């Protein structure tokens, strides 16, 4: 809690649905947004901050609260858009040999700034005396270790708490989330949403030699004609859907009522039957 990581993670597809099945977490409260809508929001960089506290201290990790750990080791302002993911770790962080490894900085002079890490080891000076380093009656160790033991009960067990702070500064967002996909359909007029390029057409097989850096493709006069498959490299062709004009040939409503229907621009095989120019 006095030296917590500040991992700045970016340039990834943050799939938060996977985090619900990695480890048996015991707390997944998110204050900012909902996890269902979180997978559809881009972010610049996520700050992962992890620490270990007791079971009775997990309530102290909140956007604004006092306590021995809430204002002395880690404080969260009233704008936290992440989560308070935490889980008990009483399977590998508790052995009967003396757990004099952690600490919680019981002594302090004032409340620390929210989202601040104070890596210090100087002897706590309780005023009215210059302490150049001494341990008696005026200046003591401002650090005190925990007493985590395996043969204990829940509430005073090692609980690993990891928060994921989100931020959106004046920089383009890197991490957005997981993007799904669908099976390709060929020789059929369907809709497409390839990398923002939306439209409708018949995705056919072309023989165009695209450059290794080009992704989209247009025509002589401002019309998309072919795009590159976002999956494994394949050169397709986007031709517009089946459209045409309908004309009725009629000998007149004076001898009979039989009419003929002419569809313009249709190979017949895309609607007796005759195929003319």
């Amino acid at each position: 809690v006095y030296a917590w990581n500040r991992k700045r993670i970016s340039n990834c597809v943050a799939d938060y649905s996977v985090l619900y099945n990695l480890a048996p977490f015991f707390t997944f409260k998110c204050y900012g947004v909902s996890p269902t809508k979180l997978n559809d929001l881009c972010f610049t960089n996520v700050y992962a901050d992890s620490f270990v506290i007791r079971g009775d201290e997990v309530r102290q990790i909140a956007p604004g609260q006092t306590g021995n750990i809430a204002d002395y080791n880690y404080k969260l302002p009233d704008d936290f858009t992440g989560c308070v993911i935490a889980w008990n770790s009483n399977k590998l962080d508790s052995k009967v040999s003396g757990n004099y490894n952690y600490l919680y900085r019981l002594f302090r002079k004032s409340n620390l700034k929210p989202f601040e890490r104070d890596i210090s080891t100087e002897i706590y000076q309780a005023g009215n005396k210059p302490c150049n380093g001494v341990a008696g009656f005026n200046c003591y160790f401002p650090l005190r270790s925990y007493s985590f033991r395996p043969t204990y009960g829940v509430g005073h067990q090692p609980y690993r708490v990891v928060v994921l702070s989100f931020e959106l500064l004046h920089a383009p967002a890197t991490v957005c989330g997981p993007k799904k996909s669908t099976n390709l359909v060929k020789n059929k007029c369907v809709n497409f949403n390839f990398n923002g390029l939306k439209g409708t057409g018949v995705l056919t097989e072309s023989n165009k030699k695209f450059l290794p850096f080009q992704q989209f493709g247009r025509d002589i006069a401002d019309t998309t004609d072919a795009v590159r498959d976002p999956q494994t490299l394949e050169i397709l062709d986007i031709t517009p859907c089946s459209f045409g004009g309908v004309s009725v040939i009629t000998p007149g409503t004076n001898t009979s009522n039989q009419v003929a229907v002419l569809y313009q621009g249709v190979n017949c095989t895309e609607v007796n039957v005759f195929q003319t120019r």
Partner: single-chain antibody, 236 residues
């Protein structure tokens, strides 16, 4: 609420070995059970804080091992003339007051801090019911603005209980008895630290004690020094 024996007088100083049951757990987290010897008149004095390593004092009271689910403070062979009350502290859960125990009469016979830092109070003689009275414990020694002090009140017959806890700079937790009607306010950072009554509800007649250190999360702090209290004597 803890479990303590009402009295203990049989076999003086041979098989007394008083304790405090009613825990049903492993003392929560930090296994630090303190023992306070409340004597009539002056303020109580610390006897032992951990299960061992007794502080500078009488050396005939030690071996407070945690047997089963209770700290059995071995008091045999101490003496045969004492008139006081032993209190034990436990239940160190997060934000849980009333850590003291009931009155245990450990009088083996029955019949037969001053210059350390400072000891001052307000002397609330004939306190008007309600109003707002301020009680201070100005300490010319230890800093009255950096250490963790507390306020504990006790009434005739009833035992002690946690009434006020104040951390270094950014915590003003109140006990469950007042539930909000008590507003702690720190005085000047280099003069003293006082309290505020804020329209008592006739239950604040108990005498107060401003301790320089925490009770349940007790730290060594070099020495445990208390101060004499004053009688409120409400007239509601």
């Amino acid at each position: 609420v803890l479990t303590q024996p009402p009295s203990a007088s049989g076999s003086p100083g041979q098989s007394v070995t008083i304790s405090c049951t009613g825990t049903s757990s492993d003392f929560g987290g930090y296994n630090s059970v303190s023992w306070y010897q409340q004597h009539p008149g002056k303020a109580p004095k610390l006897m032992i804080y951990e299960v061992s390593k007794r502080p500078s004092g009488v050396p005939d009271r030690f071996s407070g091992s945690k047997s089963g689910n209770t700290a059995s403070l071995t008091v045999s062979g101490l003496q045969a003339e004492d008139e006081a009350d032993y209190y034990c502290s436990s239940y160190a859960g997060s934000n849980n007051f009333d850590v003291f125990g009931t009155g245990t009469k450990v009088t083996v016979l029955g019949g037969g801090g001053g210059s350390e830092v400072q000891l001052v109070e307000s002397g609330g003689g004939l306190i008007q019911p309600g109003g707002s009275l301020r009680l201070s414990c100005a300490a010319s020694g230890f800093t009255v603005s950096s250490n963790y002090m507390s306020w504990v009140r006790q009434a005739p017959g009833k035992g002690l209980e946690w009434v006020s806890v104040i951390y270094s700079g950014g915590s003003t937790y109140y006990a469950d008895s007042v539930k909000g009607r008590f507003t702690i306010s720190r005085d000047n950072s280099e003069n003293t630290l006082y309290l505020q009554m804020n329209s008592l509800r006739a239950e604040d007649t108990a005498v107060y004690y401003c301790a320089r250190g925490e009770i349940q999360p007790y730290y060594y702090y070099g020495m445990d020094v208390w101060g004499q209290g004053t009688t409120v004597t409400v007239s509601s």
